[PDB]
Amino acid sequence: STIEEQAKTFLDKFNHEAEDLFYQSSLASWNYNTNITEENVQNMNNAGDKWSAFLKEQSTLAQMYPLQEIQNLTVKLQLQALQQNGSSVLSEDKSKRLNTILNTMSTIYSTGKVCNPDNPQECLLLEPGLNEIMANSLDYNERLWAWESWRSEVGKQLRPLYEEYVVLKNEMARANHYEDYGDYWRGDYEVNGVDGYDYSRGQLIEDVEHTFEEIKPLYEHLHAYVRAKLMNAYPSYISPIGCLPAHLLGDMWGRFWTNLYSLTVPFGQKPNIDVTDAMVDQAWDAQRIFKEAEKFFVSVGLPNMTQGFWENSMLTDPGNVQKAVCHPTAWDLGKGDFRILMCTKVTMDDFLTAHHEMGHIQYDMAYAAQPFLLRNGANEGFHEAVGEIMSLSAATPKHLKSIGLLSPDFQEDNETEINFLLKQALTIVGTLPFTYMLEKWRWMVFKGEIPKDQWMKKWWEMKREIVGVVEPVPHDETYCDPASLFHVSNDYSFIRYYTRTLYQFQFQEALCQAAKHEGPLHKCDISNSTEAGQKLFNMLRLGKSEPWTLALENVVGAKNMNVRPLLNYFEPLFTWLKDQNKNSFVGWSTDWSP
Amino acid sequence: TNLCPFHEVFNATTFASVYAWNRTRISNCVADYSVLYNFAPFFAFKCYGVSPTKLNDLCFTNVYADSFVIKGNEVSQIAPGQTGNIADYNYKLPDDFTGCVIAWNSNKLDSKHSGNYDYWYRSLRKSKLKPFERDISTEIYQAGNKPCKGKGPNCYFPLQSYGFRPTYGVGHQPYRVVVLSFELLHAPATVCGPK
16 A cells, blocks of 8 residues: 555544543643642643653654655645654753753743842742832832843843753754754744745745834834833933833833833823723623623624533632632633633623633634644634734724623714724734844844854844834843743744734734725724625634645735735824824934943 | 334443444334434434334334444434445445434433543444444554554554543534334334334
8 A cells, every 4th residue: 555545544543542632631731720739730740741652652653654755735744743753853861951941941930039139038029029010110210120130130040041942952953854943933834835835934034024124114103102202201211312211111021012001192081992890880790701702703604602611611710719720711622622711800801802712712613623733723823813803803892882882872083093003003013023023033043143142232232223122221241131031931932923913914904805894994893794704714614734825815815924904904093103203203223321 | 012122222221332333123013113202302313215204104024223322423424325434434324225313412321531432433444334234353454565463553453432521522422323224025014103
């Protein structure tokens, strides 16, 4: 028999066993996250060990099937997913050292707590400490002290381990026929063997740069507006022509500018739309929120939630009797088991989060017929984009008036729209230069452009040139800013956020054209539109069986990332910011106080 | 009045696997098909070549009741002309099947925590089964060119376990399927409906 039939039989056996083992592991993880006990921890550890051993054994058996002798694209993709050696290609000592370094960095980031210099006994950890401090405090000295201490204590300790981590990851990637770890991360966007839809790993950098070149004017105007607002708020500490300080960005690392909405609000005389009071008055609970989300998803033509979903999901905090991680996550245990773990309370934010998680669940339910190795989003940002488009469609005032939360006589004035667009901008466009700079720095460090003695220097240079952030304290070579980030210290990709940001607005534009929406893009609601629902389901059912370029062409009609939908979405805010900055300086200079 | 053993087939404690489906012979009794409706949660009641209302009027010589347990997605494969792992390698109905297929959800009986691995199905076979053929062979399937001896590369066991759990989805929950084959051979009609 040919090698293709043997490979198909092996894949069938692997899928059959992997479904059961992954269901066991996911059920153990769910039992742990819903009830934090030592027995649940041990069960989850045993299930994860069994799953990892199964994957290690099946990966060795898949090596005997050559990829060159496989013509079926689905079988070839499954084999490529199975034949990945990963960290098993290195020696045992190097693998143990890499695992130890990863665990040590994770513990340093998690156990790291900052103590006050005046009171050594008064110490503050990260989340209820420095995050809450940098979130709402308006003191220059306090924010500067927190920002400096967070990367002087946690920093200068991860870099001695981060360099060995980079070396080991580069060795592992070169052993896996990749140029460096950056190529190993960009391999998710790689498409081979499909004429017209191919996509190389080097093309991703070019496309991201091309998109950021077009984002540059809008982000520059937003940066000028935020700089003017901060100068009006922080006198004698902001320059009208220089960069913004790092500690005054409303966040520990400057990723999201959402916390600066209190100072950068265009019209503070009219509060934004908040249907929390309406839901409290109408006595809404978690069940009502999820039922409204289900009705929204059925209105576009997507299937309704299963009975096991309503039975097994944790939609409310179980109280003090059970310890649970209140992080909203969509759970796909496989074999028809879809659950949501969310400590839902009365809040419009929880309404949008429930819509996001139900969109994730719908994506998971769509490709359930695909093989096990293909039961994932076509790209690392597709799930996030599918969630974000539903979160956007739910937050529209039209949908809120339809579901009975806003008054039917409520008129949508221009200023409320401008405030909403500015908040969405501070949320979405503010993190694009940061993501771009972080990912580019990691890529150039992996490629060897910045070998040993220029990491912090080139990091700050790129930050000034791209994000417009100046250092309030001159950091030397011993410090390490990227290691302070969760994703960088825990070995996670970051370009996924840029890609999902682009795909979100692309999918939104496509579905609003399919729904025949007349007017601005932010007023678009895809509710009661079966055409948009079917056009989206055509992509959601594919999974990784087909290249992401083909799915993107099926949705928006393009095979690459297009930033024009984002610009069309923010065009009213762009027009307003132009008139606002007409009497102000635009741009930032790369030279300021150290 | 002599009631048929239909109660012993439908209300059995444990059912057989689809690769070892138990065929029970119904003869010399009164086939009260109205008692079958006692199991109201019927997932599917589809008769081929015969009508369920006119089933109590016709007389048959032998009635074959084939009982087994499959999953919800594979219930569609129990029909004339279907293709799949069950319809080709486990249980195949002919293109001219005269009978009715009865299925109901058994998530209460057949499901079990930590997996109910007592039900098996044949995923690999050298060729598709003939209509109403039964194969209980446990010979290791030779997928490769090398000889077959012991489990390993290209040597897979032809049987796979379902592992039913109560928290599974509706498509993966266990469904007990009873296939009633009505044969009209050159013999006196011993099976008739109630009069």
